[PDB]
Enzyme design. Structure first.
Site, mmCIF file in Angstrom:
data_model
loop_
_atom_site.group_PDB
_atom_site.id
_atom_site.type_symbol
_atom_site.label_atom_id
_atom_site.label_comp_id
_atom_site.label_asym_id
_atom_site.label_seq_id
_atom_site.Cartn_x
_atom_site.Cartn_y
_atom_site.Cartn_z
ATOM 1 N N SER A 142 -4.379 -5.703 1.145
ATOM 2 C CA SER A 142 -4.750 -6.793 2.051
ATOM 3 C C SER A 142 -6.155 -7.314 1.789
ATOM 4 C CB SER A 142 -4.671 -6.349 3.516
ATOM 5 O OG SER A 142 -3.339 -6.331 3.997
ATOM 6 N N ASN B 162 0.790 -1.228 0.000
ATOM 7 C CA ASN B 162 0.000 0.000 0.000
ATOM 8 C C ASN B 162 0.827 1.285 0.000
ATOM 9 O OD1 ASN B 162 -2.126 -1.932 0.496
ATOM 10 N ND2 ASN B 162 -1.587 -1.804 2.673
ATOM 11 N N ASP C 40 0.334 -9.236 -11.045
ATOM 12 C CA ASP C 40 -0.292 -10.241 -11.907
ATOM 13 C C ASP C 40 -1.741 -9.913 -12.207
ATOM 14 O OD1 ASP C 40 1.754 -12.534 -12.180
ATOM 15 O OD2 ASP C 40 1.711 -12.170 -10.004
ATOM 16 N N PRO D 272 8.424 -13.281 -8.335
ATOM 17 C CA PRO D 272 7.664 -13.432 -9.585
ATOM 18 C C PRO D 272 6.777 -14.680 -9.635
ATOM 19 C CG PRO D 272 9.962 -12.923 -10.025
ATOM 20 C CD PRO D 272 9.876 -13.259 -8.574
#
Ligand SMILES: [Ca+2]
Ligand SMILES: [Ca+2]
Length: 279
Positions: free
Chosen positions: A224, A161, A200, A175
């Protein structure tokens, strides 16, 4: 199945467009899958978990969630009213203390624990781990996340964040796991959400209603909150047989809503988690 007047995030992941209020999902609802929530713990007695949650490990004096954060995330994975996968089994691992803090050594231990513990559980449809935590870059933390993924667990982690590139944070920057950014109900990148090429997928992360300790509910915001949407979706898709732990992140990206989000920096994917449900 259809849940009317659902939390906006659940509705969003079963729609091609923002602004709907019904969550559409297959009745199988993640039954037979298991999700480890690696966090502050889970208030397992909360009515919303219907007996499907249990603590399996703590690294502190108690196994109770004295914070609320873990219970919130678990609720988004699999509570009756607020969860993506409403029939999944939830396992709590308390690696964070009741202030929401934890040492990297303890977080690593928690990940290695899950890789082993899953071999003792009946999870015929597969196993997911949801990690709504992180801190500065650490190759050891990244390595632990990679091991957990390698052992056959679908690992989803928060991007963080800091409104920054997630490359400087762990385990976000590993990754091989599924790194999750946050969006809001108007399909904007959440103003706090990290970004970058290592992301992703995005999931709902601003103003997310879920379970809280003391048998309550509350709405909070963060990557979160986005992470358990994706963890729950993975459990859901694995139960339907659409994908496996090894390829769920890829499958989720492949089948995502594309190009819907605004305020995405060049080089960051524009992909929003989507369950592709059709009645
Ligand atoms: Ca769209
Ligand atoms: Ca990845």
């Amino acid at each position: 199945a259809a849940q009317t007047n659902a939390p906006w995030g659940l509705a969003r992941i079963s729609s091609t467009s923002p602004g709907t209020s019904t969550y559409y999902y297959d009745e199988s609802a993640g039954q037979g899958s298991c999700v480890y929530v690696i966090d502050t713990g889970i208030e397992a007695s909360h009515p919303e978990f219907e007996g499907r949650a249990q603590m399996v490990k703590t690294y502190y004096y108690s196994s109770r969630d004295g914070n609320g954060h873990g219970t919130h995330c678990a609720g988004t994975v699999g509570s009756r009213t607020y969860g993506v996968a409403k029939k999944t089994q939830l396992f709590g691992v308390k690696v964070l203390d009741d202030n929401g803090s934890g040492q990297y050594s303890t977080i690593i231990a928690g990940m290695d624990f899950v890789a082993s513990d899953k071999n003792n559980r009946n999870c015929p449809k597969g196993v997911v781990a949801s990690l709504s935590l992180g801190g500065g870059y650490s190759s050891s933390v990244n390595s632990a996340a990679a091991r957990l993924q390698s052992s056959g667990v679908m690992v989803a982690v928060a991007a963080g964040n800091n409104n920054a590139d997630a490359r400087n944070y762990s385990p976000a920057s590993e990754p091989s796991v599924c790194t999750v950014g946050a969006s809001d109900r108007y399909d904007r990148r959440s103003s706090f959400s990290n970004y970058g090429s290592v992301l992703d997928i995005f999931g709902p992360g601003t103003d997310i209603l879920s379970t809280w300790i003391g048998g309550s509910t509350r709405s909070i915001s963060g990557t979160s909150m986005a992470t358990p949407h994706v963890a729950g979706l993975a459990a859901y898709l694995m139960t339907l047989g659409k994908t496996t732990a090894a390829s769920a992140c890829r499958y989720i990206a492949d089948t995502a809503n594309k190009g819907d989000l605004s305020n995405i920096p060049f080089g960051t994917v524009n992909l929003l988690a989507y369950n592709n449900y059709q009645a």
